[PDB]
Design a binder for this molecule. Structure first.
Ligand SMILES: N[C@H](CCC(=O)N[C@@H](CS)C(=O)NCC(=O)O)C(=O)O
Ligand SMILES: N[C@H](CCC(=O)N[C@@H](CS)C(=O)NCC(=O)O)C(=O)O
Ligand SMILES: C=C(CC)C(=O)c1ccc(OCC(=O)O)c(Cl)c1Cl
Ligand SMILES: C=C(CC)C(=O)c1ccc(OCC(=O)O)c(Cl)c1Cl
Ligand SMILES: [Ca+2]
Ligand SMILES: [Ca+2]
Ligand SMILES: [Ca+2]
Ligand SMILES: [Ca+2]
Ligand SMILES: [Ca+2]
Ligand SMILES: [Ca+2]
Lengths: 209, 208
């Protein structure tokens, strides 16, 4: 630290890493880039891959949301207990990212025509995370092992936005349903989720959710 | 004991295979045909309903980048530092973003999409040139001064783009030299010349 998040005024791809920092007792600065500022070109041109989020951790500049998650997971001890658990954490996170990518494509490119199909396919996309919970301490702790990992924050965000897209999608998945409530109730995470810094942002950039 | 379970293509296993070969490792290839896959049994038993599946002794993994990170962690190909680890991830995530765009082209829009993709390509390659320029004059690796899992994934990405668009690396001296230097590593050189690499198509649908 100090931590600085540089992003558009939305939850989007920074929602998980923000929940992670809040839950871990960390403070950070939000640096807001408007559409107008972005279209000016300067920051985009100076960004490694022409994209946000950009993340500062002291003198380290990072890009890529999952790089930020893994960095915080590594530096804050949210990466499982050994090498084998680290691999399971990665596997869960990569799974979350695949669904996030599908979600974003819907939101951005094909919301109106694609929503029906997306919602029909949703149970089958959510089931693996239910299966993973069932295989770990009866779904009663975390997605991997007996300590929170960066993959938990990412999965939690994914589930939250899908309950918004498709209210009741978690009703068929008792472990995932209970997991959302249990993690959301963690006192520091509970505070953050109720705060204006979370509540007063839209989920995505285009008005859709 | 390593086992790769995948379709008979290079695809998302090309990088982890180069990694295992260059690190002096043996592994078994278990081939899943289109006909077997369509039968449904392996797809249903797979975590996310997809390949590759990777066995490492008693450990079963899915997700190509999970496999890369696992091998990188277990074989010491993940930087010297927590900070270098983060830079390795950043490069790999960048490689994955372009790989995802490449696959979308190949699979969904090759004929109509290629012209636009090729025009956009220099701007998509430029960041990896810039990273090389900031690390020991581009003379070693993408991050630090030891090979990482990100190197194998980036090398694969570059090799397939030269097939898609011959001469795309000509404007990028560091990326061009990097492809030759890594490809010349003796164990990797042998693998890249071997039937198990050469006799596979890059993708599943006949396009490249
Ligand atoms: N690989 C992604 C890339 C993030 C991304 O798609 N950035 C978007 C906003 S979430 C963006 O900067 N778009 C603006 C542009 O490309 O000009 C990540 O995990 O960070
Ligand atoms: N997130 C990807 C998923 C791999 C993937 O897209 N698998 C394809 C072939 S490379 C597949 O199994 N498709 C068959 C299907 O979906 O039924 C990874 O990194 O492994
Ligand atoms: C997170 C996103 C929505 C799902 C997203 O990708 C995105 C892209 C461009 C954006 O504006 C910059 C611009 O003028 O394009 C904004 Cl605000 C967002 Cl949120
Ligand atoms: C990215 C890919 C590999 C380069 C890919 O999308 C893919 C998907 C399905 C496939 O067959 C299974 C089927 O019958 O669809 C195959 Cl062989 C491939 Cl290579
Ligand atoms: Ca703050
Ligand atoms: Ca601020
Ligand atoms: Ca811990
Ligand atoms: Ca019900
Ligand atoms: Ca074989
Ligand atoms: Ca090493």
């Amino acid at each position: 630290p100090p931590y600085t998040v540089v992003y558009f005024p939305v939850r989007g791809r920074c929602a998980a890493l923000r929940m992670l920092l809040a839950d871990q007792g960390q403070s950070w600065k939000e640096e807001v880039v408007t559409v107008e500022t972005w279209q000016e070109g300067s920051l985009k041109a100076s960004s490694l891959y022409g994209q946000l989020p950009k993340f500062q951790d002291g003198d380290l500049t990072l890009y890529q949301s999952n790089t930020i998650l893994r960095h915080l997971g590594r530096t804050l001890g949210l990466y499982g207990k050994d090498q084998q658990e680290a691999a399971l954490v990665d596997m869960v996170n990569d799974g979350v990212e695949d669904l996030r990518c599908k979600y974003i494509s819907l939101i951005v490119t094909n919301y109106e025509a694609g929503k029906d199909d997306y919602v029909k396919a949703l149970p089958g996309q959510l089931k693996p995370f239910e299966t993973l919970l069932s295989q770990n301490q009866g779904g009663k702790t975390f997605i991997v092992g007996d300590q929170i990992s960066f993959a938990d924050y990412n999965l939690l965000d994914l589930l939250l936005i899908h309950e918004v897209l498709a209210p009741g999608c978690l009703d068929a998945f008792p472990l995932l349903s209970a997991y959302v409530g249990r993690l959301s109730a963690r006192p520091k995470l509970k505070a953050f989720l109720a705060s204006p810094e979370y509540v007063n942002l839209p989920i995505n950039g285009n008005g859709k959710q």
